[PDB]
Design a protein around this ligand. Structure first.
Ligand SMILES: [Cl-]
Ligand SMILES: [Cl-]
Ligand SMILES: [Cl-]
Ligand SMILES: [Cl-]
Ligand SMILES: [Cl-]
Ligand SMILES: [Cl-]
Ligand SMILES: [Cl-]
Ligand SMILES: [Cl-]
Ligand SMILES: [Cl-]
Lengths: 295, 48, 35, 295, 52
């Protein structure tokens, strides 16, 4: 016959394929002709405005005023949003705290030195133990949220250097395998989930994960070039293969700050050049209430 | 708007002009506290 | 009612063949980018 | 003249008075004639239905099923409600957690003995350190909420006794003044805010406060008479002279459970007769976010 | 925003930003010689891109 069941992996996309088939199940069908869709404007230009430096963003009881801004990036061209009913799976009514959790939290500050390797933080690991957000993350099994990341770094017009600020979804870390490569070692909880203090990259060139830093720009990113800007901002939507997930067992993405062009300045100029990270979860939703669990 | 004497120290009283502004300088330590004061406007202190 | 505080830009396109090239001459700052 | 300023203490009520006046300020006026309004149906009959035993109330992820119920009392005939904009004063947007806080919490259980004096708990003191509700109470300066109180006590058809369950707003406690009355002693924090374990009355007849137990029924109350019912339920609206207040420094009301007719039973029948308290805040609102404070 | 600029001609492009605007000598733009002014009768060659 020819009429069948709707069980192909690509049946819920606005991209159709022409196929041939004689079995009752759709996945048995051939790959077919490939339509030719394209969205080059979500990676190459996921910027704000699809006097830009001058700004001020407010959320919750917190407000940031950025002026040497390099505009704002909206990761993959999508805004954070509460989970829609079609995608939802868990049946209990989620709690949406709003103001007490969707606001700006400012984590520890790091110091940029002429020989710094680079740092990274995991989300939501960084806030699991901070304010009301953290508390909700502990009392609930499920969590879902978006993020606003603001990285700050000032310096005089006589300093120079460039930080690459990027977001890498599912940032799985690897070990140097005993050096020789004969030891199947693994990163300890302290390295995979460094908490709010973040961690240091030992081999930035390969992002401590066997992949080229040179290609990290294929991820939502922004640069902080001292002669141009002193802060970067990136809005990040929720990304996962599931609608909600544990804020404890799974880190949706990592934030990397790497000095691609090393800090330099003539001796006599301020040598303490800090980098500060301020983040705000957006559209935080929690579900599966029970007692508090720290991990 | 009128000026707040945030720098209302016992050591200023003889050189009062100094109370009209407080300093910031190159820090050697991150996240230091620069100054603090109560927001109570009718209370004795900077607001006076 | 007795309380007043309780009341994606990019899309797809079908491109079957590579974009074309148009003619121009000896003539706004599009060479310098803010990467 | 005769036209004046609107500054009398009784200018915002649906009860007018006829007066005489010659000063520009309204409060200078005489008391005047008293209109004759009355609402005897908010104290004498603030019951549910203005098969009643059979029931089931659900809020949050919790559900109570009561069947030997004595109906339900709505304190002073009013339902809990989020604070309206006309009454509000604080300008920041409040957080309204909903499900994570408006649900049923079941506190420690007490044991009723033939010689028990009686117990009491303070609100919101009892939950300041429990679940998400407590956490919000700690992180916020201001709090406002209503309450659903469910007191439970089972016993066989061969036991007897009667508990008076009442709510007393602003339950200020007094001391026996050194006995002779010459010592101006005061109750320690542990007696005024006993926490979730509650406290024991030393002189129930005068409610440890120089007032007759005999008149406590002038307050929202309900009886648990073993031969008739084994649970009581009282909805309580927010009551204060201010729209919001500290959940730490001020207890809006106390819950009293007193054996007015002592427990009795023939030896051989179950002697362990517990009393359990389950409460659910309603329409919880918090404001004035900052760091967590326990007291 | 007169300083900011970019002029292109042939396979070459200049990007000037601390510019002081641009001067057009004697208020006239360059132009191929018109037939009324022309005198030599052979057809001229106008290479275009390879020279301009
Ligand atoms: Cl194909
Ligand atoms: Cl550091
Ligand atoms: Cl390296
Ligand atoms: Cl710090
Ligand atoms: Cl004051
Ligand atoms: Cl009268
Ligand atoms: Cl117990
Ligand atoms: Cl007990
Ligand atoms: Cl007594």
């Amino acid at each position: 016959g020819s009429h069948e069941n709707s069980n192909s992996a690509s049946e819920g996309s606005t991209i159709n394929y022409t196929t041939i088939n004689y079995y009752k199940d759709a996945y048995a069908a051939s790959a077919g002709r490939q339509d030719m869709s394209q969205d080059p404007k979500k990676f190459t230009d996921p910027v704000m405005d699809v006097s830009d430096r001058v700004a001020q963003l407010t959320i919750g009881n917190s407000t940031i005023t950025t002026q040497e801004a390099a505009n704002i990036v909206i990761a993959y061209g999508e805004w954070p949003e509460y989970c829609p009913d079609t995608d939802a799976t868990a049946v209990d009514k989620p709690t949406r705290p709003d103001v007490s959790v969707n606001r700006f939290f400012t984590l520890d500050t790091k110091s940029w030195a002429k020989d710094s390797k680079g740092w990274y933080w995991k989300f939501p690991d960084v806030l699991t133990e901070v304010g009301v957000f953290g508390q909700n993350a502990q009392f609930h099994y499920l969590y879902r949220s978006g993020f606003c990341v603001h990285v700050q770094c000032n310096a005089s017009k006589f300093h120079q250097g460039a930080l690459l600020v990027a977001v890498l979804p599912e940032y799985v870390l690897g070990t140097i395998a005993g050096g020789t490569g004969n030891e199947n070692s693994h990163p300890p909880y302290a390295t995979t989930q460094p908490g709010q203090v973040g961690a240091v990259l030992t081999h930035p060139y390969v992002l401590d994960a066997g992949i080229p830093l040179s290609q990290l720009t294929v991820c939502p990113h922004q640069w902080i070039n001292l002669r141009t800007n002193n802060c970067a901002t990136i809005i990040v939507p929720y990304m996962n293969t599931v609608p909600f997930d544990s804020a404890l067992n799974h880190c949706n993405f990592g934030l990397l700050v790497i000095p691609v062009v090393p800090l330099d300045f003539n001796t006599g100029a301020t040598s303490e050049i800090p980098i500060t990270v301020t983040i705000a979860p957006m559209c935080a939703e929690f579900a599966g209430l029970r007692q508090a669990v720290k991990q | 708007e009128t000026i707040l004497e945030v720098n209302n120290l016992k050591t200023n009283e003889t050189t009062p002009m100094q109370r009209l502004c407080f300093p910031v300088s190159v820090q050697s330590k991150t996240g230091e506290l620069c100054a603090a004061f109560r927001a109570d406007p009718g209370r004795d202190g900077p607001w006076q | 009612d007795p309380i007043a505080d309780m009341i994606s830009l990019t899309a797809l396109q079908v491109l079957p063949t590579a974009a074309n090239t148009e003619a121009s001459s000896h003539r706004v700052v599009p060479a310098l980018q803010a990467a």
